[PDB]
Ligand binder design. Sequence first.
Ligand SMILES: Nc1ncnc2c1ncn2[C@@H]1O[C@H](COP(=O)(O)OP(=O)(O)O)[C@@H](O)[C@H]1O
Ligand SMILES: Nc1ncnc2c1ncn2[C@@H]1O[C@H](COP(=O)(O)OP(=O)(O)O)[C@@H](O)[C@H]1O
Ligand SMILES: Nc1ncnc2c1ncn2[C@@H]1O[C@H](COP(=O)(O)OP(=O)(O)O)[C@@H](O)[C@H]1O
Lengths: 455, 455, 455, 459
Amino acid sequence: KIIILGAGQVGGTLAENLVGENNDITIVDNNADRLRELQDKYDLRVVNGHASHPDVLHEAGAQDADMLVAVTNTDETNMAACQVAFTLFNTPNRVARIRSPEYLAEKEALFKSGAIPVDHLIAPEELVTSYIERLIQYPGALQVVSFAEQKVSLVAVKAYYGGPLVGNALSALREHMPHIDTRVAAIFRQGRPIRPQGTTIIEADDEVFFVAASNHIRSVMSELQRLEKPYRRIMIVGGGNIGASLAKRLEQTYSVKLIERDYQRAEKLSEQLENTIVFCGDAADQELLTEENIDQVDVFIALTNEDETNIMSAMLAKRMGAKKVMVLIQRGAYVDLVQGGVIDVAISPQQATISALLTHVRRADIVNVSSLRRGAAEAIEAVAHGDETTSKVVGRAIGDIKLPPGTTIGAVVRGEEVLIAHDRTVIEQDDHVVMFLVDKKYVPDVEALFQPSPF
Amino acid sequence: KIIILGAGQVGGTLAENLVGENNDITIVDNNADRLRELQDKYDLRVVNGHASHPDVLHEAGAQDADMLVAVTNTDETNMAACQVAFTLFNTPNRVARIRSPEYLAEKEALFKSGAIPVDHLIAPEELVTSYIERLIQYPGALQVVSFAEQKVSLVAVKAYYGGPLVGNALSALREHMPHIDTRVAAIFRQGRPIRPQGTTIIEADDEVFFVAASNHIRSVMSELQRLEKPYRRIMIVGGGNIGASLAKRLEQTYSVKLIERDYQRAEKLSEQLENTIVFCGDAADQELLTEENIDQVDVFIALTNEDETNIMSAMLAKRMGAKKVMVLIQRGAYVDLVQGGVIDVAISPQQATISALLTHVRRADIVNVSSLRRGAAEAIEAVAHGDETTSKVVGRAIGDIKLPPGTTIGAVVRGEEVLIAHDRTVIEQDDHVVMFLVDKKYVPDVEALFQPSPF
Amino acid sequence: KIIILGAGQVGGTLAENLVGENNDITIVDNNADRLRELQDKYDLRVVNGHASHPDVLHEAGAQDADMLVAVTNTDETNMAACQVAFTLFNTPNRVARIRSPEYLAEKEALFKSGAIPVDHLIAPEELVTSYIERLIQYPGALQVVSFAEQKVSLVAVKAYYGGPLVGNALSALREHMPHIDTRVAAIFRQGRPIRPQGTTIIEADDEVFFVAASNHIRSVMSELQRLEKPYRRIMIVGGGNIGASLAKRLEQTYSVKLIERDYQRAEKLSEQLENTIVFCGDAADQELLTEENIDQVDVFIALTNEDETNIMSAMLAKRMGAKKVMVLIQRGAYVDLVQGGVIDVAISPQQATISALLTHVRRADIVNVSSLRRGAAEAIEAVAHGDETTSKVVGRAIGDIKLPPGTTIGAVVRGEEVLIAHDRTVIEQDDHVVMFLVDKKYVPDVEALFQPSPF
Amino acid sequence: QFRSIIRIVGLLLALFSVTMLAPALVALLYRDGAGVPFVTTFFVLLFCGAMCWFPNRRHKSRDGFLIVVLFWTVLGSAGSLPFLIADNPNISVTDAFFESFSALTTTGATVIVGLDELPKAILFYRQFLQWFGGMGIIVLAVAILPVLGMTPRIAETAKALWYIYLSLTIACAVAFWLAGMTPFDAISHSFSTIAIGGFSTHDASMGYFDSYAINLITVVFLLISACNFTLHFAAFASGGVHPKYYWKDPEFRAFIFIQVLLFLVCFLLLLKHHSYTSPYDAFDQALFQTVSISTTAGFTTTGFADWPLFLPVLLLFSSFIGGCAGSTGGGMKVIRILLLTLQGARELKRLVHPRAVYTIKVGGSALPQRVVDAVWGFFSAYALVFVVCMLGLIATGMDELSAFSAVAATLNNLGPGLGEVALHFGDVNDKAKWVLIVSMLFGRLEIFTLLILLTPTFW
Ligand SMILES: Nc1ncnc2c1ncn2[C@@H]1O[C@H](COP(=O)(O)OP(=O)(O)O)[C@@H](O)[C@H]1O
Ligand SMILES: Nc1ncnc2c1ncn2[C@@H]1O[C@H](COP(=O)(O)OP(=O)(O)O)[C@@H](O)[C@H]1O
Ligand SMILES: Nc1ncnc2c1ncn2[C@@H]1O[C@H](COP(=O)(O)OP(=O)(O)O)[C@@H](O)[C@H]1O
């Protein structure tokens, strides 16, 4: 039995992917946002009242009720919130969020002792930054997700002018690592997809999609890290609790210029932030960006509260000469719409945690389980269910399957071993097949393709 | 050695009282404005840090430093602070301030010894509400202060036209309870003080100050409760947690009309409050008060955020026909100024909490220690220090002391026994003398009277 | 000697295009920000002061001002200022800006006959901005700009799937009106330019730029009005002073659905607006647009205060099925980048007023003068100065000029006659040449082409 | 709140009368002379303190300025009595006020010649005045922060400072006597080497004994005593918490930078001229004279006979940038100069990157614009007082270049100024001697505490 708590900046999204368990799901948000929004966009339960009074908590059950999610903006309240439940109601599996972070600093010795009150399991919303840092390294790494319990990983890389990918034909990339078994899924060029086998990679912002075993991905990405000259200039346009801590994490290794509109916040940053040139102006006006070498910046990160300001400022820094552009999108409708080519990567704090956790979460095996990205593209992990002939697809070969247009199977996982599904596709497959769509409006047809004849 | 958490507004005044013999105070305030103000109080040491973080706690924790007083604006944080404190460093004298109050309902379940929260004593701001209720329970109870660990209590009562005090000579009041040993300290009439002995209590709102042992005070106030006609209608003008919780606690016994300036707050209140007619308007306009039987209301309580709005609305309701007027003053400069005659009582919530917590203090035990009052009068609790002749006042008789003008000795607490001051009585060493000034600018002259020849 | 008195947003743009060419400039800063930028540039004279206290006016103009320009946010003050200018330190060719509808409607005729001397032009920033209605009136009217003095007009039309232009070869369009002398400047297709002669315009929606005399433009646009099916349904996502009056002006002929985020404003609109269904929600959420037949709407107008909200909402309504998309951009940096591809037309009200006033009253004679537009393209109106051989371009033929890449000469204005430019034409001294760049970063080189041999 | 001050003034010069006994005890220890004046002054001062301790039972910002101004003026006039009464150094009233103020105001200036052959009681009381004003300086500077200048206890630091101030003077008298110094001269020179005074019982301040060790020890305890005593508190509280707690304070870094630079430039210049025959000697004398004068101490080991005049002039300007703010020292503490440099750098950065928010960060923390404005109000008041003092000395007929040197020596709380005032303030004009006393008062009071009294807006 699952409960999460109000109001939840992210928690609501933690309430959409996690509902796939057969056992009963409940979500209770803080007040009206949880209920009204919650009832309208959600499925089976909930809840009310301010946190963290005990009266709202007993609705979770807590009679060997397995899941407790303490989504909270403030930590000091969250710790007491989880404690009232254990003492009064005794909920067994407990999880917590702490952004203290002095407590986040000392919790590895404090919380890994058993004395600590009730929340051994932890989840910080501010460790998404490390993913931004990985993006700043491994230059031209737009995205990576992992399927089959992190067995196989799809990666979306970008080819920059002057990089090692320009001019080299895909066969040379295939020959540069003869010990890596990878599968080029698709290549998006100026927004349109392209058949990739044996073609010269066009330098201007080509997006190349690998699909391979985690060992192969971890090796090719390190090789691309070795060849491409690392980034040295980073510009940030947000003074937020995420922007500040990212500037802290980056300032020692890179030269950081940060932008804020509220003078008092800028002053507080310039006090706190050393080695980081902190400005005071709108992220929109060119008269500051050009005056501040916008044509020479390598990575332009937008961490404003408003999504539209991120998108527009970052599209302007992309026009002016920034190599890689990143934004903070709080609406999946935006990330599905604007982010190709013009905006290289958006950090949905919802999907940044969800992508990793759903992969680690059991079982995620349905006729179609979708990990979704930017654009009309799709990366699915279809499951072939049915006997030797009851299913359209079991026992047969991919070259003989009537797959939707643009759909390319990348790898096939059986057990602990992964196959790249080349040509005939010799297979054992009861077993999990990793696919890639170019237009995601064909997701249901693939479900129909893998859905056996209903009894 | 004392540590407090002067995160809350109240803490500073508590810090002011505590300083003395064998007392070392540490303030762990969240920010420095209040710090600058508090620092001016002598013999203090301040550290700037979040309330509950182990860095400040370790300084406190490593040496137990006796009692830890966790007084904070936010309850969840105060509880988390008190717990991180104990289960990091034991700190067995820990105290907490929660304005929860819902938690106060389950205080016997979460807080009890051996639990993780580890709260020993809870100090809420609810007492002012209970105190206001006590004020409304006794029809003429303008004020009560407590001296010598609640052994002796001074009380300021008001004589209303038609009451039982009116027209009766002080000797008849003395004979109405021949087993009660009380001492009338002073009597203010039309703003000017009067020497009280065998005198007729003029009906024009004479204010009479009793000084006696708490047993006798609890008996004379209950007798005045029995004699005086109780109030039937009551009016309140603020929507806050104090106005709300007071209306809730009072509505069952009296007919309550509450006034609000925020329409949405009024709407939210009318749901919660049953039997309470909840209005929506400024406490200033007569067009609502007259329209709402202001001439027939008994007590007008002002619990607005703004002190000046309380003072002005209540000064208008006093002119319009309210019998008793009460306000919530958050500025001691105002409470010393307005509480005289036109406003029957001003209730500083800081002194409202302190009087209750301070009463428990083992002893103030300073050459002169005063209890702050309505003005312009003062009631102090001098301690008689010095040998038979090295001090001006030890060993001599009350009739022989050269007290400052208007200064009246009320009672003398010897050991655990209380005797009320006749002019025969002689003062001994280490004897607590409870006094009453009419003009408080003579407080130092009394200290000089009680200060022995310097060693 | 022209004086401009504006604290308003538009005056700044009016300080670059029309002043500085063979004339002295004076502006009124009105103690505002804009005075600082121009002063930083250093080609300007400015006086700061209230509009119009006589102290500021006397320095600004003392019976010698000549042309007067009163730009104000508030009408009553602007009127009082414009008359104070006349009676005290009398000035000529004064102008006023009345944004208020009631005064504008009842202007006849005592205000200009009249005691208040609002002589000649009364430019309103709103009625000229309701030219947005004309954009809906002429389907496929992405833009129109005016060169010379409203003699030759460039127009940017869009070819929509199902429209009358798709599939038809450019030669058939040229033959469809053998009495119309127009010249297609350039053709943008999927963002890339194309040389336009006898080429079938691809259905995927091309942008075609006509350049011809205003009579020919007024005839081809009326013919395209006749051919294209009119837009029945219109949707607006701004409850502003522009959105309201646009809904009023449109509601009678089209079915208008309006969106607002402030409930009280929405209620006031639903009272004011008849025949217009006024909603209450964010322009961002799909759950309202899809619920409101976003897939079937023809024109999506965004008149929010914030530019980024316009851009994002309109990029979403364009993705969802709107045929024509319009936004209100108050930042010149944004309009260039966004206008090209997913926002069909962006209407900066500053350039909306500027185009009308500049083209009508002022004959741009600043060597190569330019009109700001959509995309990376530019359309300039160079003036050919110098004798047959001192200048690079006078006396020679268009086919022999070494024009920068993408630069296309559109027309040649000879005094009072307009010629459609051919490679065989001859250029004469002091003749206005209307041009069209595809990449505007070559604007300076064209100056070098038209700059005569320096004396 | 006038007339509530006399009580403190009386109790204070009563404390000072009690302080008169220790040198009187030294007089009775060995009877060189001057015992009678000491006892006479003790009684006259305790009697005056009782006369001024009659307005009692009276207690109630503008008062504190008139408290510290009387803490220096009254106590100086009280200390001017022993010289007035005694017979062996029979000196005018003006020379007596001068010697008393300079002893107490920490300025090493002296007007008595023949210190060696003088009663050991008097020239002990001189070093005791320096030690007293050392405590007064340290206590006042760290215990009153309205003008110029985690927060610990008020009194516990009022005694931790006294503990450092005594654990230093003890270990220094010890190292002196261990280096071959009379135990009397060792105490008398630890009274003055820690308080950064510049006084000695000998006409040659540090030339009476030319031991290398004495010079190196004086240099060491001058560097120790010029450092911010609040920072020594970090080495005191809970023992030796760090040995590099110092290097975090950027004031210490600027202090060591200045001392090392000025040292090696004075040493290289002292070698270009071959002023000393042995570089092992030039090194010693350079390091000692830089550390002595830069630290506004006032000790001298040489007569500048072979020294090029540039080096003494450079030392006088170096005296302007004196000791750190949290210790005994002259005007313009090294922290105001570090702030000046940092602000120059800030204004430089505000030209390459104009639309940027820069704040004066000292040790990681930012400074409120009130403090940074006060540092330059202090520079302005210092300069516009210097000029008036110089013109005042010149008006009384004093030699001009000598006037500028005497002013820069006294306003800097540096006893010896080069020129006509090389080793004695004796033959100085008398009116110029009073203006000089005013200058040393200015230098101790940080040019603001005393100037405010003069301002009409104050009264
Ligand atoms: N161009 C801009 N427009 C709006 N906000 C901006 C812009 N540039 C920087 N910011 C800043 O983004 C910061 C928001 O950070 P965040 O922590 O998300 O806010 P909050 O703490 O309210 O969540 C604010 O400092 C805001 O001023
Ligand atoms: N003029 C007024 N008349 C009546 N009520 C008022 C007036 N002004 C403010 N109030 C009430 O005071 C409330 C603020 O009280 P406050 O003490 O801030 O609340 P809390 O109890 O949370 O501390 C407002 O919500 C409003 O209801
Ligand atoms: N997200 C949004 N969706 C719809 N309307 C919005 C949104 N944000 C702002 N608005 C509208 O913008 C309008 C403001 O414009 P208006 O008041 O005419 O002049 P101004 O542009 O100066 O505010 C208001 O109608 C406001 O409701």
